[PDB]
Scaffold this active site. Structure first.
Site, short mmCIF file in Angstrom:
data_model
loop_
_atom_site.label_atom_id
_atom_site.label_comp_id
_atom_site.label_asym_id
_atom_site.label_seq_id
_atom_site.Cartn_x
_atom_site.Cartn_y
_atom_site.Cartn_z
N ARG C 50 0.65 -1.25 -0.11
CA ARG C 50 0.17 0.11 -0.10
C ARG C 50 0.79 1.20 0.00
NH1 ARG C 50 -4.76 2.24 3.85
NH2 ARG C 50 -3.46 3.61 4.20
N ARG C 91 -10.23 19.66 7.22
CA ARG C 91 -9.16 19.82 7.92
C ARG C 91 -8.97 21.04 8.69
NH1 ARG C 91 -4.21 16.28 6.81
NH2 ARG C 91 -5.28 14.52 5.38
N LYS C 216 -13.38 2.10 -0.02
CA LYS C 216 -13.20 2.31 1.41
C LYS C 216 -14.47 2.61 1.87
CE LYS C 216 -9.28 4.12 2.78
NZ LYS C 216 -8.54 5.37 2.95
N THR C 274 -8.18 -1.54 10.13
CA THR C 274 -7.40 -0.63 11.16
C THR C 274 -7.21 -1.13 12.38
OG1 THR C 274 -7.52 1.70 9.93
CG2 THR C 274 -7.44 1.83 12.32
#
Lengths: 498, 499, 476, 439
Positions: C50, C91, C216, C274
């Site tokens: 990845r 962000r 995802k 994760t």
């Protein structure tokens, strides 16, 4: 799997000591006498049938009084079923009693009362006055249990049809007419049917076997024909036409039980389709929790022979496997030369079939097909059956005055017998159509009121002990109501006998 | 669940277009003629049955020659079955052809050949010469479909028994006695049954229906009775006694198939027990992957009537439901007044029962009862059936010369037909006892070697597309061998039918 | 048939499976960018490498590409490279000279006092507003001017659907780089609509037509629109990082089970993502929680299991891949029976295509004969993904003519690819060279030997375009 | 039935269960010894307070006892106290005590140090001999019994004889205190069936198990043990590194959430916290999360699958006592009962109902307080204490049944118009089942 079960069948294992399936016998010239009825009972008769298609009220009064006399001597509670004539149609009478028909020929089928008694090979009468308007060209008329078939060529007249004869047959006086692809439109409770229904309600018949039920409203029409007096009498609808099988779900909800009247069904629908129709109807009644009866030519050969064909034995056996509560006989008991021998043979087959089908399989199949949430009543009745399976109960005792609870326990098909401590004799009689039940009558008048239903329980346990179902130490599942409520059972007890 | 299945059945849905179950017919006076046999075939006769309990070799040669002539007319490969007389016996002849018996009376049962043809209500002959020493007092003799019962009072002499008549009955010339519960010393292959079997082999009979099989050793006795000329002829063992039911597993292994001969079984064991016995035998044969036949009084009323009872229809349907490959017609076709009408009725019942059981339940049931690992031959065959179920294949094509692979595919009960591209005619005839199969014979002489197996495949797919099984645009599962280690099909293809 | 009845009969101390079916995906960072470190990872268990496009220049991601190709070439392996997009995310930058403190009760020059222009319009009054890993939260005091709103101290917008392009200006340049480089698959971040997947599919032109799209799922929309997302994709990643913050932490377990099983029935590779062995970033062995996490990801039916920072910034990168291998083999050995196979087959709608009916039957044949391996001739890898869909116990060997499919099959469980060079050996129009190449490869790699039965799936004499033929061959 | 068919179809955002069935066990240490920290834990979701006797004086453990009783009294709860026995406890290494692990006749702290021929030392599979009930352990157990501890968490149980050794250590007085055997070795897993029969429940002590057996094997060992306890009808506890990251962080890793959920999915009655609550910086926060995960996992497995799985694995015929309790569960499933009311004094009837895993709670009208504290280990039971000395005798199905119904109504489990299943004994062990509308 069924395969895995069959490969492990032990043909020579000991059979079940207690018969769960019930036998219904039609009463005729061979079995109307008290001695013949005592023989039938002692042989395995649970419900005595009266075919109202033929016979005066005096003739049917004799059957009633004789069944009550015979059952009284033997100390039994035998149900009496009134099988209505219904929207049935036959031919007229024939000049010199016969009429031979050859294929390729032509016969005028009139609805003219002038030819009612003067029926020849050229022209004859039929009951249905609406027949030329219902049957259209190309359509087939099935005279005499479909052995004679007539194709409709043209409607010559107002009330006559010219028909082309398909097969060689000699007909005789007053023989039944079937109309397969034809929607009849006739009353279910005809003026004769109505009076036949007021007689039975009066003299106390336990259940009605309603002939040619097509719709859900038809079973309701019969419900109204029996007044407040006949409000508690059961309605077993007879499925014997294409419309009936088509509307089976509606008919089931409206009725108290169903009869797979295979006689007229095998002519109204193709003979091969009756097997699939029987399986489907019986299983639908099983899920519904309503008594289902099998009904025609089950042991037909035994009307003249002392032993049945290999086909009859597998018939009565598979009627039991498909899930039937009851199995019936028609020609066999009524006009047969071996009436006690035929009931005895049916008993042996029913016990063999039920010994092979000693399963928790039917219970799980039925339970899984029920919608959740259940009612506290049904949830108690189904769990009473699972409790029995878990502890290997030798019998289930239910305190049911109306019989609802007993029919509800039987719905979940336990392997052990179901003893019903009832206060109503009508219920002891009406429960003869429900598989595995064995009613016990508690005489409330002679003794006491019985607030705490302990006497009824002790009556049941004692009856179960003496009748050899239970023996000291055996576990028994008792089902009844608590003393704070009534109407429906809510309590279940697991008791070791005394 | 079966309940959940039955509930959703559609009574008036259209039936299956192709019949999977097979019909076996006994041949008698009503159907020996070429025209009558042509009628039976065109009706659905898959196996012509010759009951060797009655008839000379000349009479049985006529049935053979006529069956071959009839099937030749319609271009069919109809199997001929030789049904042995076997161990158990029949009574003598009667003075004036009949004799009536009343209960409470007494009848002397002799084994004296003088009374062989002069049998009266007072004394009559029986085939078994060892009978007076085998039947001991209090023991019952069962005459005519186990109808007439005779309780043995005493042993009169060297070859006579005095018996007390239990029930009223009138029987005629040469009708079977059963005597269940006796140590009967009668052999599987008697000197008559060796001449009978040697006749069959010399004639070319496709299969044998061995009567009164009790042990697996008896099957090998029959297998030895057919020599090197009869090494490929099938042995269908008839279970009609308590011993045969008890030793069913051993006989199954020894046999090529089984017959639930319900006639003598219903007398040797209680009538009610036959249902349980039938279910158990048929399912054992299903798991084994060997053809099982159901027979005796299937549509008995149709010997005299044009329509069967409600019982006869549920009997034929449940024989199919039980898992029977074949259903048999005994006197209905042999001595009946409606022989083509009875085969036609059986056909519609078989198709109805088949249409109702149009499921993967049987295949699942059978497959799960097979022990793993499977042979590559059986793993290819069973997967050929599962592939068919998954893609809704309208037909499975198997290239099987012996019929082993076709019997192995049919073992897993697919809903579609099985076309068998066989190089053998004997295989075309022997596969009339296995459900779904429809054999196609590739010449090999009046054709080529076809070493590459392509011509037989093309013969297969063309036979189905013609016989209307497959229509351009729907898949077909093709099972055969791929040029390697000899002994089994090992390759499976899924092919869309072309035009 | 019960799971309970299976668990009671587990022999925990029994021998393990000889061949690992589950696949390991590792993130490449400072600890593992070197050819020697990547050679170590591959020998340890890695199948897909990845490239997290959240951080790094195209020069940096070019060294990961070149080094993975170099390391795989030395070991003679076909390792897939996955481009994990930055995707759409709100962000807030660097605080008071790098870090400060906020107490309860210039978009990058904040300290602790006061990106998405559609924020006041997409989010209605009341609810939750997340800031900095979801850890810090925001209680909006009032509706405000410009874009920013005045918030009371108690990045991500929960439950509610957001309007952000699927292929942002950065992602467009990333994807175009990937395609030009020859990246094998794309790990599309924050997929919410099946239309977004087709937006990504359009971002890679005819040049990137064959590259896989692994969507995802890391938001509420992606989970509530799963089915259509699973049809437009080539596979799915249960990106548990952002999912655990977008939806309650406890709901992720149920979401994982449900997504993995949906992908199983669909026959599309699913990846668990994760904190799988997070402790091993600093420790030589994992917590009891992480071992049960990796095992249950396998038990749930995941094709692949992933390592984000364990391998990227971790102190034990070969040690963590090795542990994951041990767990995967254990969980696999416990999941030995045809429970999953039948499970998946019965949930398929009839009729199946002749192609899928051959594949599923090839798996049942294997189960019946106890086949030591299944050999599929698949150039695109479709057929191999279709065989793996039915979860056989044995390995699947894929005789492929395309190196791209040798690399793309590292995401499908039980598959071991074998590359047949046409330009070197011949055209093999009779398919026997690729078949003998597969049997020989299975013999030498010890999967099969003499006497063993092998299931051989490919296309027959007339047929072209899909496999339609199945063979059962006893290895000579 | 089909796990796959159940998973495809799970509705992630459906409303969760309003009443938690799974139970949380917390180890008590410096962070949570104070009555006000225990009140916080109990409010968070603490059912059993554990005392690790491997560390601490009897004065320290007396403080935990008295404080648990005080905190539970304020909140009006019956919290069980569990005594976790020390059990057999194990470069320079010359034994020689003077130079001062404890074993004079190799890993350190959950596997960090190793080599070849006061920190937890573990020699994997060396014929290391040490008794089940050492002289200290007999003194630890006698203290527990004298104090009134509800259950014992027996460390390093390897044989069924060891369990009887512990049962004898408590004697006549501690006959009623439960024995939960800790499986943390190779032969403790190997002799699981014998140990299950001998014990009252089992603990999957994953700490020492993960070192004594390979780390990967613990998953398979956990599944196998929990399911064996499920069929047996005995409380099983999952135990180490459950939410380990929450000792220092306010949120757990994605691994810790799937570990807690799996433990529930596997069929565990209880789930445990060790350091997390004992030495952790977020003790109430860790119990709270564990609660959220347990409710999510419960909600997902709402089905009758576990009940049918367990029931089919029981041999027939059943005892009338178990046939009534299993049928009480099937009745609940059929009528969608909002509760099951059991009149159990020992709790053996409540443990038998919980064995068949119903979706609804099990209210237990117990005449004992020991039963109220010991039922914190069994799933779905929410005990109600009937004070016999205060109200009356009550040999009739009336007062306890009424208290039980009134409790389930005030605690919001049941309202007017809901059906409840009442299990107890008749006039002439439980043998009677009632289906009553709460009115």
């Amino acid at each position: 799997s069924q395969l895995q079960h069959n490969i492990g069948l032990s043909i020579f294992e000991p059979v079940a000591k207690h018969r769960a399936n019930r036998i219904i016998c039609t009463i005729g010239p061979s079995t109307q006498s008290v001695e013949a009825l005592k023989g039938l009972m002692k042989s395995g008769m649970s419900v005595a049938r009266m075919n109202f298609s033929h016979g005066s009220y005096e003739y049917h009064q004799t059957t009633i009084n004789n069944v009550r006399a015979a059952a009284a001597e033997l100390g039994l509670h035998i149900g009496i079923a009134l099988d209505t004539k219904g929207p049935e149609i036959r031919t007229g009478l024939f000049k010199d009693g016969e009429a031979t028909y050859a294929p390729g020929d032509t016969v005028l089928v009139t609805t003219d009362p002038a030819f009612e008694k003067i029926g020849t090979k050229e022209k004859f009468y039929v009951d249905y006055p609406q027949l030329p308007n219902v049957v259209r060209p190309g359509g087939l008329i099935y005279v005499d249990d479909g052995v004679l078939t007539l194709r409709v060529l043209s409607k010559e007249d107002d009330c006559t049809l010219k028909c082309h004869v398909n097969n060689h047959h000699r007909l005789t006086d007053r023989k039944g007419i079937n109309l397969p692809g034809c929607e009849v439109d006739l009353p279910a409770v005809s003026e004769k049917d109505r009076k036949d229904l007021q007689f039975g309600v009066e003299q106390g018949v336990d259940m009605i076997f309603a002939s040619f039920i097509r719709t859900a409203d038809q079973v309701r029409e019969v419900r109204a024909a029996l007044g407040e007096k006949g409000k508690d009498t059961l309605i077993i609808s007879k499925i014997e036409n294409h419309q009936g099988v088509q509307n089976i779900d509606a008919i089931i909800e409206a009725s108290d039980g169903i009869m797979v009247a295979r006689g007229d069904l095998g002519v109204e629908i193709p003979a091969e389709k009756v097997v699939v129709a029987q399986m489907c109807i019986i299983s639908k009644c099983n899920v519904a929790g309503k008594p289902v009866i099998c009904a025609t030519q089950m042991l037909e050969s035994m009307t003249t022979n002392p032993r049945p064909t290999r086909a009859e034995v597998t018939d009565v056996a598979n009627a039991v496997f498909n899930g039937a509560d009851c199995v019936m006989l028609s020609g066999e008991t009524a006009k047969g030369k071996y009436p006690n021998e035929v009931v005895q043979y049916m008993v042996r087959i029913c016990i063999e079939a039920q010994s092979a089908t000693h399963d928790s399989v039917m219970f799980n199949s039925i339970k899984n097909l029920q919608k959740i949430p259940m009612s506290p009543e049904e949830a108690v009745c189904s769990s009473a059956v699972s409790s029995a399976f878990e502890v290997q109960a030798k019998a289930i005792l239910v305190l049911s005055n109306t019989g609802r609870s007993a029919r509800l326990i039987s719905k979940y098909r336990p392997n052990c017998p179901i003893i019903c401590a009832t206060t109503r004799l009508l219920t002891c009689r009406q429960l003869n159509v429900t598989r595995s039940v064995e009613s016990v009558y508690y005489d409330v008048d002679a003794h006491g009121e019985d607030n705490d239903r302990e006497k009824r329980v002790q009556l049941g346990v004692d009856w179960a002990k003496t009748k050899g179902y239970v023996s000291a130490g055996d576990v028994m599942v008792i089902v009844h109501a608590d003393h704070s409520v009534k109407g429906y059972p809510n309590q279940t007890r697991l008791v070791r006998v005394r």
